[PDB]
Structure 1
């Protein structure tokens, strides 16, 4: 009645309500400011988070105790095969908000995506875009018209792309489909680029580059129904308390005579949407490269995949993004990697990294070896073999 001692409230009221996300694919809610002066290009990319490993590198940061010295950092690797372009959607400005006027799709869609439109594929007749396809029959018009409508009206333009989830260890056959804003220049140029890419493929190395700071958008890992203590970091009550002690003791004063939206309560924890910013690209992997995991210092032939394989994920056989630190969501989960809404100049953000070594030991226990070759060298001959 004036709280005896003062403390900060538990938890952030800007991340309410703490409910399950609508979709498991978190929504890109903002794309970068468009600079229509530069080449048409994608502003985000879709991938699957595969696991984390460890890096070594010299730091470059004059004035730091750790300048010109080796530091060792957690990284996370996200499996990033090429994305296929299959549509363009045009948006108009209105006094009520951005609104979509049409979507024009590609003549041919793969099963991977088509499957996204069904709940019972095994037994459907797979009629998905079968009448739409015929719009291509006519030398162009129906399609060519709608393209023209987007050129004429339309204020922002997004492509529709999907993951090639089959190029990935996942059991799931259904691919993930998303709109991604086209930021390169000019509405007309945008739709042509889009037209030209229909059914074609786009790789990450045409979106993102080493040292870039990028944002990650993903639904957070679920945890089911949580109590107040772990959900909000409320303080345990004393051992002595009757009727349990993972609670908050006082849910409210007498007036307002209503439990209030700001007190902590049990309920869902996890499976929330997070846009996490400022994650520096430390590697852009090529899938064709059998030295993915190597360095100009660690010259050995090895791929990024850990001995044993990424736990609970499998192998990395495609292009990949390696990002410093960590990212929301869990292994297997779809992630959108978005580019920065701003021009960071951090010095931390401008630093150019070069890896020196990338861990590759088994993450399935205290792994002591990077490559099968190294293991055999150390152990010598066993009772299997030879």
Structure 2
């Protein structure tokens, strides 16, 4: 007989299977459509989620109840030191999809990216790319031949870039290497851009700008094996239930005489690849710029780092991207920020946000002071110091 009271199904069947992502770095499965009149540019960037904070800004939304008023908003900080371009990959199109024809690497690779090709770096002889670097022996004839092949072919061009994880406070020391599509015209000049940027750094400010809508692609925080109640949001069974209540009561009818794929089951929760779109960049700040956390309204010379450091992360010392709201992935996780795949014009995008104040109170507690100088001024002199 029928369900006898309608309810929406629990969970989204389009995010199946709820299995662990095959890699800790979520793959970018779609790049922005190529407009071949614009200059050559990366379609994405690699960063490390540092943590969240809060900002105050005047809302610009005519017709809204809070128009020209002050709104407090949550923001996520992504430590984004410049990425080192170390190679180029050419992609030809086939009746069976895109296919990598050849990859041309830079002559010199840093130990950061070399560690990525090693499970046991400490006891290896570090022979990686030693014979490849010999292709630059006298004139780089083989490198030029491969680049000529990429120009003659490879309707899609991607650069291989790696993070400078040594500039982050992470203990990993092993760089993250990824392919970033080169948008802009003339595959020939895509290859020229890649070759000219071999062994060179590209900063996040050359990829992204303020008020831009971007997408965050990351593996979510893992939670291990989870019951249906929290994995799918199913109703808790009554307290009277024998054999447990954090379950689904009926996991299927008599026919089909099988548990169906659509029924909520206990299993792995979190550590899933997610691509969340339309996150507005609130700041493109620079590590070399002190007063990173300052605004035109605050003028207090302070960095983006909260007092005591970002909890479980450390201090931001590099370029950083501050996006509105929250993004998938936990602190210290590698995330990929990609340009939006469409042109959003909705007055939520295209809104020019000007931060009035960035919170730098300690996230290790109920932080009361934005700066150590402010703590000094409020508290007065102490016994130890001050």
* Bin for the TM-score computed over the shorter chain: over 0.9
- 1:235 deviates by 0.2
- 1:249 deviates by 0.5
* Structure 2 residue matching 1:224: 3-state secondary structure: strand
Aligned partners of 1:316 and 1:94: how far apart in 2?
44
Aligned partners of 1:105 and 1:351: how far apart in 2?
40
Aligned partners of 2:184 and 2:138: how far apart in 1?
30
Q: How does 1:70-219 map to 2 (within 5 A)?
A: 70-219=70-219
* Structure 1 residue matching 2:189: 3-state secondary structure: helix
Q: CA offsets per residue over residues 126-181 of structure 1, 9 Å max, x none? A: 00000000000031210000000000011000000000000000000100000000
Aligned partners of 2:354 and 2:112: how far apart in 1?
37
- 1:50 deviates by 0.1
Which stretches of structure 1, 4 residues or longer, exceed 4 Å deviation after superposition?
none
Aligned partners of 1:385 and 1:239: how far apart in 2?
57
* Structure 2 residue matching 1:11: 3-state secondary structure: coil
- 1:385 deviates by 1.6
* Structure 2 residue matching 1:178: 3-state secondary structure: strand
Give 5+ residue unaligned stretches, structure 2. Answer: none
Q: CA offsets per residue over residues 32-62 of structure 1, 9 Å max, x none? A: 0001101100000000000000000000011
* Structure 2 residue matching 1:19: 3-state secondary structure: coil
Aligned partners of 2:279 and 2:141: how far apart in 1?
45
Q: How does 1:20-59 map to 2 (within 5 A)?
A: 20-59=20-59
Aligned partners of 1:153 and 1:337: how far apart in 2?
28
Q: How does 1:55-66 map to 2 (within 5 A)?
A: 55-66=55-66
Aligned partners of 1:343 and 1:257: how far apart in 2?
48
Q: Identify the residue that residue 267 of structure 2 maps to in structure 1.
A: 267
Q: CA offsets per residue over residues 13-42 of structure 1, 9 Å max, x none? A: 000000000000000000000011011000
Aligned partners of 1:218 and 1:205: how far apart in 2?
21
* Structure 2 residue matching 1:98: 3-state secondary structure: strand
Aligned partners of 1:185 and 1:307: how far apart in 2?
46
Q: CA offsets per residue over residues 246-265 of structure 1, 9 Å max, x none? A: 00110111000001011000
Aligned partners of 1:177 and 1:191: how far apart in 2?
19
Aligned partners of 1:377 and 1:138: how far apart in 2?
64
Aligned partners of 1:318 and 1:4: how far apart in 2?
58
- 1:239 deviates by 0.4
Q: How does 1:299-314 map to 2 (within 5 A)?
A: 299-314=299-314
* Structure 2 residue matching 1:182: 3-state secondary structure: strand
Q: CA offsets per residue over residues 217-250 of structure 1, 9 Å max, x none? A: 0000000000011110100001001111000110
* Structure 2 residue matching 1:378: 3-state secondary structure: helix
Give 5+ residue unaligned stretches, structure 1. Answer: none
* Structure 1 residue matching 2:279: 3-state secondary structure: strand
- 1:185 deviates by 1.2
Aligned partners of 2:244 and 2:149: how far apart in 1?
65
* Structure 1 residue matching 2:46: 3-state secondary structure: strand
Aligned partners of 2:3 and 2:20: how far apart in 1?
33
Aligned partners of 1:238 and 1:349: how far apart in 2?
45
* Structure 1 residue matching 2:183: 3-state secondary structure: coil
Q: CA offsets per residue over residues 325-378 of structure 1, 9 Å max, x none? A: 000000000000000000000101010000000000000000100000001101
- 1:291 deviates by 0.6
TM-score normalised by L of structure 1: 0.99
- 1:209 deviates by 0.3
Q: CA offsets per residue over residues 258-286 of structure 1, 9 Å max, x none? A: 01011000000000000000000000011
Q: CA offsets per residue over residues 43-97 of structure 1, 9 Å max, x none? A: 0000000000000000001100100100000001000000000000000011010
- 1:312 deviates by 0.2
* Structure 1 residue matching 2:256: 3-state secondary structure: coil
- 1:383 deviates by 0.4
Aligned partners of 2:153 and 2:339: how far apart in 1?
26
Q: Identify the residue that residue 282 of structure 1 maps to in structure 2.
A: 282
- 1:201 deviates by 0.6
Aligned partners of 1:83 and 1:13: how far apart in 2?
36
